[PDB]
């Protein structure tokens, strides 16, 4: 029973990780624009 | 002790030393020192009397403090270098702490205050292991970290070790304390030449281990722990007085013997680097070592002290001790000065 169910849990883990992988380009694009937004804000307030 | 357990524990001592000698990671260096101390503690408590428990406790406290200062030096190295390679240290504070930790592990002065107590508290075989084999791993680490060793620190430790190991042995009548203060003076000689030429450091360490192994093996084969018990050796085995004579004359640094080889090569490599005052003061300070060596030769070989009557019974029995490599070590400790350019094999 634990054999069948842990194999099912591994297949479900792979499905979760593929959802994460399919979302990682969008999250990486948003993260890049996020950090460049915050650095540009810090740069302008450092200039003033 | 079980002989199986004895062999496994000595292999673990040797294993900790080898792990220090081969590993490229600082954690494994620290692991090797931990394994070495953890395995040598039963060798010191082989006979189970309060002097061995006191000696093992003092040895534990000193080597534990040095191991923790070693790990602090390693941690400051991981701060200021982000890595773990056993090479030069990337901070003078880590270099100072590691040089202090290795000075405590070697028992160099002014961290020398455990070596005669611990050497007196333990048997002659465990004292042999402590004064020969336990010098190998910290000198290997000092051999590897020498691009970052502070010169003034290591030479202060060196000359202070030579001077205190000279004056310490002049007051002694116990043989193990004489060998321990001899150890302190010779470790000063080894670390004085380290930043100049560490091949001569390895030469001094090898000649020292040969001569100290010869003296501890003669002291085991005669079962003598004091000066005055060594004085009865002429009436028991007169060849042993000859061998301790030539080995003590060797360890004093007299030519044509091989104990002159290391100090002559050390003076030879320190004058090249424009240091004249320091090898001259080191050479003059080693005359104290020669003085208490000649005291022991006077008490053993050159005169005949009074014996007792019960020695006549011991005339009727041979030595059934395994005097292992004693003729080989006696020949190598005395007649090796014509083979002085053999030192290049340690380059």
């Amino acid at each position: 029973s634990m054999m069948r169910w842990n194999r099912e849990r591994r297949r479900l883990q792979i499905e979760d990780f593929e959802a994460r992988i399919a979302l990682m380009p969008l999250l990486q694009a948003e993260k890049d624009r996020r950090v460049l937004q915050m650095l540009r804000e810090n740069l302008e307030e450092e200039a003033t | 002790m079980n002989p199986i357990i004895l062999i496994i524990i000595l292999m673990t001592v040797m294993l900790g030393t080898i792990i220090v000698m081969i590993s490229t990671h600082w954690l494994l260096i620290w692991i090797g020192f931990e394994m070495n101390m953890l395995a040598i503690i039963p060798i010191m408590m082989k006979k189970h009397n309060p002097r061995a428990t006191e000696a093992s406790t003092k040895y534990f406290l000193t080597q534990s403090t040095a191991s923790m200062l070693l790990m602090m030096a390693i941690i400051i190295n991981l701060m200021f270098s982000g890595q773990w390679t056993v090479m030069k240290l990337f901070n003078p504070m880590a270099s100072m702490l590691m040089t202090m930790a290795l000075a405590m592990k070697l028992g160099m002065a002014p961290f020398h205050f455990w070596v005669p107590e611990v050497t007196q508290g333990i048997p002659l075989s465990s004292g042999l292991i402590l004064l020969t084999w336990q010098k190998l791993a910290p000198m290997s680490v000092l051999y590897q970290i020498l691009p970052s060793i502070n010169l003034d620190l290591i030479l202060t430790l060196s000359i202070l070790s030579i001077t205190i190991g000279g004056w310490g042995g002049l007051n002694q009548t116990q043989l193990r304390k004489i060998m321990a203060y001899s150890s302190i003076a010779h470790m000063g000689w080894m670390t004085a030449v380290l930043l100049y030429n560490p091949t001569m450091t390895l030469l001094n360490l090898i000649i020292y281990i040969i001569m100290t192994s010869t003296m501890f093996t003669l002291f085991m084969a005669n079962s003598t722990t004091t000066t005055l018990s060594l004085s009865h050796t002429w009436n028991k085995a007169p060849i042993m007085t000859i061998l301790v004579l030539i080995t003590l004359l060797s360890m004093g640094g007299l030519p044509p013997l091989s104990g002159f080889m290391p100090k002559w090569m050390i003076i030879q490599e320190m004058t090249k680097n424009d240091s004249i005052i320091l090898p001259t003061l080191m050479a003059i300070t080693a005359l104290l070592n020669l003085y208490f060596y000649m005291r022991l030769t006077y008490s053993t070989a050159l005169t005949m002290f009074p014996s007792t009557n019960n020695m006549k019974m011991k005339w009727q029995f041979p030595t059934t001790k395994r005097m292992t490599l004693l003729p080989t070590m006696t020949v190598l400790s005395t007649m090796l000065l014509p083979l002085t350019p053999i030192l290049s094999i340690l380059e």
């Binding site: 990780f17 994460r20 | 357990i5 494994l28 692991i31 394994m35 039963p42 189970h48």
Partner: protein, 169 residues
């Protein structure tokens, strides 16, 4: 105040070390080292070392300091000036260091030290569906093969050594 939480726990850590290191008795010294181990565990937990902090509680405080209090109970007897004086000495040295590195945002005892909260030096990214600390500890079995060999050999030898030196013969 709350951005300085690791710093405040580290001040409690140094105060606990001045507490037990001034050595009132091995019982109260054990208590001070227990409280110090707990707050230093909290310091480790506030960087994301959850497994390593639970290793502090489970192994350090859980086994080793329990064995220290156990052995103290077999070696001390149940029923000063120097302890309290050295306590307030270390406390004043620590608070003068706190006051300098807070009013100046800079100090140099042996190294130069920042005076801001140590939140500043963190990473701004994620680790995905794992802990990096957990995976690095999990690699003791696939990458730390030699490390496991020497650690297990030292522990087996340690069992042998304790049975030798406590035997008395």
């Amino acid at each position: 105040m709350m951005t300085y939480i690791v710093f405040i726990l580290s001040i409690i850590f140094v105060m606990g070390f001045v507490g037990f290191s001034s050595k009132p008795s091995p019982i109260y010294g054990g208590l001070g080292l227990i409280v110090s181990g707990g707050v230093g565990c909290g310091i480790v937990l506030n960087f994301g070392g959850s497994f390593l902090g639970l290793m502090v509680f489970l192994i350090y405080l859980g086994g080793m300091m329990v064995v220290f209090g156990y052995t103290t109970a077999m070696a001390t007897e149940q029923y000063n000036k120097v302890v309290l004086g050295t306590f307030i000495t270390g406390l004043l040295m620590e608070f003068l260091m706190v006051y300098y590195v807070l009013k100046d945002k800079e100090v140099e005892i042996v190294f130069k030290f920042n005076g801001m909260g140590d939140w500043v030096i963190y990473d701004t990214g994620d680790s995905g569906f794992f802990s990096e600390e957990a995976m690095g500890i999990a690699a003791l079995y696939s990458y730390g093969t030699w490390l496991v060999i020497v650690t297990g050999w030292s522990l087996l030898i340690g069992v042998v050594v304790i049975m030798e030196i406590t035997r008395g013969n």
